[PDB]
Symmetry: D2
Subunit: 474 residues, 4 copies
């Protein structure tokens, strides 16, 4: 298990090939756009060594201590342990960090446990898992093709190599060219280029991993959403801005030992479901969204009490709505673990029904949770003087005009600055788009659910009920 210092030293020594506004980022640990999130990830690693949480965040195995997200669960109790670690890490950042490495460790863990799925590349997968686990490395991933012409398949874009495709194969490995649309949290040691491809997309049907410093690999950052470094003025964006980037592959060499899937469309399409990676990554997600909803509930309640709006029925109802959604997520989480069963490879996986429910329902609930905070806070959400204003000549006036019902002005503004950062700052607004799409496009996710769900039991019950209807003709 890594310490924060080791993570920081690793990024400083071998920084990811990041670019910000036309320039290479030489040291993300000190760069104003990335130092906040780097310190945040470092704090997550350090927590693994805190005596209070060591037993929750790590496990011992033959003299070594590994991060809990690498644990191959054998019992439901083990699943619960993984869940508690997901939750503890999530709570540290109020569920605002959506791509902490444990999400992808869940994927790689499942891939390894179900390694036989990958055929000749099975050993590569098992070895990669051990590598990530032993070194406790941080990962980032990019799974979607460039948004160019969505009316055409990957092979029908303006150029054959817009999506990442194999240029050629050599004795050393494969050379790839193209790009992946989005990679969140590129402050990692490794990048996973993992897998719905249509038939005839063989050259794009790939799955591999690479060090983020690999020659020819570039991460182009979008506009930064860090509001500043003041924790008062920017409570969340100053520390949890994970960054999103376009990933470019300029004839990058992928060593054979890093290849997990090559030229197999079906193998790519069913990788997450067959291995159980889908189940485990969604397990981290349900714990994460439960933590996120808890944070929103806390802020909504404090805001309402803070300005005396809690006496109004509709405000109480809005907060109760968040409570209902919180309980729904807790329920999915519980059922996912309690109904867990082993898959074809013997890997215990949390229930897909419950997790499909959670990941397809939360994208609908989050925009409403965000709306509720807006409706409760109203103008208080944009009446945001800075800590500098409180420290300035008008400070005394602000302490009078911005106090709340039994709440001091500085505390009140600190709270609304947080509520604003969770909803209306560039950082906060991005979180909304993130919740709507991180797991996929709802339109296709729902179509996928329809097709995979076993609807026969219900159709049969109705056919049986209709027997009496048709008997009138006998």
């Amino acid at each position: 298990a890594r310490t924060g210092a080791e993570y920081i030293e690793a990024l400083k020594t071998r920084p990811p090939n990041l670019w910000y506004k036309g320039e290479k980022v030489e040291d993300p640990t000190t760069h104003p756009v990335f130092r906040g999130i780097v310190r945040t990830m470092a704090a997550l690693y350090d927590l693994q060594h805190d005596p209070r949480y060591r037993e929750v965040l790590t496990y011992e195995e033959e003299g070594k201590r590994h991060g809990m997200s690498f644990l191959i669960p054998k019992t439901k109790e083990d699943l619960k342990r993984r869940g508690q670690a997901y939750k503890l890490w999530a709570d540290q950042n109020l569920g605002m960090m959506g791509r902490s490495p444990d999400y992808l460790n869940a994927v790689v863990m499942a891939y390894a446990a179900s390694a036989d799925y990958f055929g000749e590349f099975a050993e590569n997968v098992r070895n990669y898992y051990r590598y990530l686990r032993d070194q406790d490395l941080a990962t980032t991933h990019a799974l979607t093709n460039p948004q160019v012409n969505r009316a055409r398949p990957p092979s029908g874009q303006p150029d054959p190599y817009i999506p990442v495709g194999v240029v050629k194969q050599t004795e050393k490995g494969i050379v790839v060219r193209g790009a992946r649309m989005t990679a969140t949290f590129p402050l990692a040691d490794e990048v996973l280029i993992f897998p719905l491809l249509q038939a005839g997309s063989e050259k794009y049907a790939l799955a591999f991993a690479l060090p983020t410093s690999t020659p020819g690999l570039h991460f182009v950052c979008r506009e930064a959403l860090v509001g500043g470094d003041s924790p008062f003025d920017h409570p969340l964006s100053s520390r949890v801005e994970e960054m999103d980037c376009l990933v470019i592959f300029d004839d990058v060499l992928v060593p054979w030992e890093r290849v997990f899937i090559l030229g197999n469309v079906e193998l790519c399409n069913n990788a997450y479901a067959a291995t159980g990676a889908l189940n485990h990554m969604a397990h981290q997600v349900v714990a994460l969204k439960t933590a996120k909803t808890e944070a929103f509930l806390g802020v909504a309640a404090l805001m309402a009490e803070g300005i005396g709006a809690d006496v109004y029925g509709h405000v109480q109802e809005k907060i109760a709505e968040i409570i209902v959604y919180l309980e729904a997520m807790r329920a999915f989480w519980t059922r996912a673990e309690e109904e867990a069963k082993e898959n074809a490879y013997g890997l215990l996986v949390p229930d897909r029904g419950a997790l499909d429910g959670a990941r397809n329902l939360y994208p609908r609930l989050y925009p409403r949770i965000r709306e509720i905070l807006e409706q409760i806070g109203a103008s208080g959400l944009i009446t945001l003087p800075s800590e500098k204003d409180f420290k300035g000549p008008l400070g005394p006036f602000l302490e009078k005009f911005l106090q709340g019902a039994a709440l001091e002005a500085k505390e009140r503004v600190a709270l609304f600055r947080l509520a604003w950062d969770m909803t209306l700052s560039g950082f906060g607004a991005r979180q909304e788009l993130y919740e709507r799409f991180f797991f996929g496009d709802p339109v296709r996710m729902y179509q996928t659910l329809y097709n995979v769900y076993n609807k026969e039991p219900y159709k049969e019950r109705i056919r049986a009920f209709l027997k009496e209807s048709l008997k009138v003709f006998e």
Copy 2:
């Protein structure tokens, strides 16, 4: 455990004091408006003796066999057993029967287990429970005051005795006068007049039970929603029309042994929560709504496949939405049982958090589930020829024009007649209003949730997070 024949004989012998369109109902077992639901309840009782379900629906105790809904659960396994019985009974009627007696048996069971709550009336409660259990009687209940002037409390209506109040107390019991707004499924042996009263409502703070044939007690039926007796034309209304009625008390004598609460506002207000009746009745409800949602999923899928509409993405998405809601209810159900703990009286009760989530979320989901069926079926939902049309001269034409994609015309119309009866018939539409309000007014239910929920843990996490914000002033 009662058989259907015993239930039918009991209603025939001592019929409830029902009135329909100005006339007394002498025999509900043969009356056209009530015979269907009577046969349906009778079938539920008969199922208790079916070898296939006897172990699910009943339990043995010292030579006797009792209905599972009377079982005082001591373990989570016992809770699961109660849940399986709720579900099996619910499935028989596609979750359309909302007031089957097991809902109220759950209430009385909890009242009895937590009998100490009732003080001097504790023995009356325990004895009443044993009575209902041993005789396996059917119950109905009425808990709301007449909807007259909602701007005023029970004591501020046009007359002091519009709500049910105590006129006087005698050596035999109490004399009550007034009315209860609604009692669903009055085809029962007993009626429960159970309990938010404001201070000063002592004369209305009552809780008692009476035989439905008690002199002075009247049940005034609303417009009947039985479409007819043909199972083809009216698959649900011909058998599951439970009926709703206004309950009148014309100076009715309630024997002291039937009094459970007398003149105690606080005791009335906290009765369901303190005894655990709330938890157990909501447990029956979550199982019931899971069954109901399963029925809607089955019909939606069959309709879409039936007319070839399943090939359209948005139709698949609508069905997937029902699947998401189904999984949400299953999740609440699972967590309610898995997180069960004993209350102050030592009674194991399913988790209130999960159940409050389920009963406050389903009223929002049901209208949408109903809407989805409407959007999928479109004009097919009102193109409803009768079985008589298929049996008539134009039958051959109908078999051609109303066939579906690989579905025979009679089967197609049988299906759409069912979908219509579940949504658009008077019977179906009532179900919507029922789901919106049976457990209470959402406005007040949400206000109640806000006030009872422990929000402190979340507020504290935020206050802790804000410590760094306020430190900038140090």
Copy 3:
């Protein structure tokens, strides 16, 4: 202009070929399922002769008096006149009659004014218009193909003649075979079989009209939704149940003079838009929905005041929501008339933009308006004793328990019976499905709007705004 007596005599003399539950309807003017709506239509005709409304409902032309819906408007004032007639007729039935003949007269009027559109059949159209106008006949229409396999086109169904198609052409006319899915209000003298067909549907690309008594023509009625004849118990279903039916064509001969379009797919697809029939029929619709919304507003307000629920903020807000929707419809109506312009044939047509807005927005608003009534009335909506109960032994008790805040019990129940009939009776629920689909499937209506709307002006404004963005590279 016809009188009600003339309409009744016409239906009695030459009744439409209606079938109800396997039997031919010999006299719809006296049949229990149809006599109510027949009397209602008769009353609409009689209103044309009422001195108070004669100038609003009819116009004089060379010694004759014609119904206003036949007026070919030459000025915006004429459009306003047509609108006032639509509204006056609509108000008579609280906007619950959705297929009164003036809707189709608007279509035929436009077809006639734009007769050149039909080529060689132009004279047939002009003559048919004059026929309907002079005789002031009632019409019904059926435009959709049987809902059998929606995954395939009209030519890909289980049989080539499921949809209405031409079997052969003779010296007398064309012989057609097939069926139309739905025809509402078949208590008419004439049926219009008017027109999105895909290429290759020539044999189905038809447009013609026939007397409803034509040999081989059959109207198969769906389950009746008439609750009874009591105006107290069934205020709307006893008089406004228009009925829906499947229309069968058993090798029906259509005389050449009744053919308007034959074997021309494009001509069929653009018929409503090119002639202006779309604009005028939608004009009747916006006036109709304005009347309907006014009725819902009135009932919602009376219900709230009636039970003292009007003192609650959220109830006031719900009623205000209906007011907002009412104003939106009034606005569309006003703009449709004020922005009217002549089409290619010189026919003044109300603005399509405003009408497309109204007909695509109301299907979304109506379900909410209906929901609002449910949320306001709650249990009062199913506490529906009959007039027979008030006339019976328990009458005195009901007058006490069902009175409202300053409202007598009989008046209160009369009101809630109406609210129930507008929302929850089989009649009321059907109205919801009707609003969702009568003008077409929202999915395709929205796709149609997207494709026909001129989006260029807005795209150009954005491109212009972006000029400054691209200049940074100069």
Copy 4:
């Protein structure tokens, strides 16, 4: 009529008493946070002198040229003229500038036309109007009390002078102390402290205006939302960030000639409605939101076409939804002008029904319009490289990977940067909160609509319809 140069010189000479992060803003015309919006307002003034728009934006009167927003309309044509000016100004900034001065000029114009309303202060109002008109000054306003304890009235806050109240009256005027919660666009010459106060709020029942440089008057700015100065990277926030601020009154002297209402609660509460200011300001708003919706439609269409997503039905439907909302706003606008009538003071005012519909409906529509853009753009909305990236080493790669369907990469990113700035940047997200609340709290706005609307006509129609119901008892 002012030129942009005159406006800039005025702010430079007598800058508003603005504060940003604890420091006084000496010159907002050059300050990085304010120079953009100052240039934007200056451009609006300059447009008044453009030969192409002079006749639309100004009117001639006795040798002088005044801004159209000052025109006291005498005919509907004059109303149309005011509307066209509102629209032309709005289009310049895609409807993103919500507090351009013409909104408040509409208020002052109405106040002046209805000056008699103000009694002894009538002349002050007329003179103030002439002052603003002749000098063509820019105004800002603040109408709400500090959000401290919303459970209590203005007189029940922690201090009597949290809200703005009169400390004392002198021969020169009144001395006021307190604060107003929000003032948008403080880059103005004048601030309007205009008016629902409860009885007993006399000391707070004020209405006056002051130069923004008045001693003791302070504007405390919230966190700035200017993303930068690049029009490519920040197309809107670089120029339309109006800024919001808390307004402090430190014993400010208000000259008697600037007092419009003093110590009169009722006069304050009915000021906007009685004078017609409500009608005219809402008229500017409906034109503004029509312009805003047009911009969103243009961007949505370009985005969909740009990435080839326009071929998908649901995307077309989402764009059509925006079209429906656009037409709804156009309709309200048209009806507001066409149904205009004179008020009690003889001032022609646009219809309140239509405007109440527009201002109470748009706050519900905007969040959905914003959501639609998010659903269409998906990950493209956060894949935002900078113009600096295109100008850097990876430029060639970006031109390949971020091109669209028949759209160059730079154009594509320019477009998505705009879409992002309209929805997800701090600037864009604020616009959402702004639309939800700028005209007031929806909860209270709806309650206000319920209370002021004449519901009698609809209630009467229902009572009349129910006559037949009650006749069954005769």
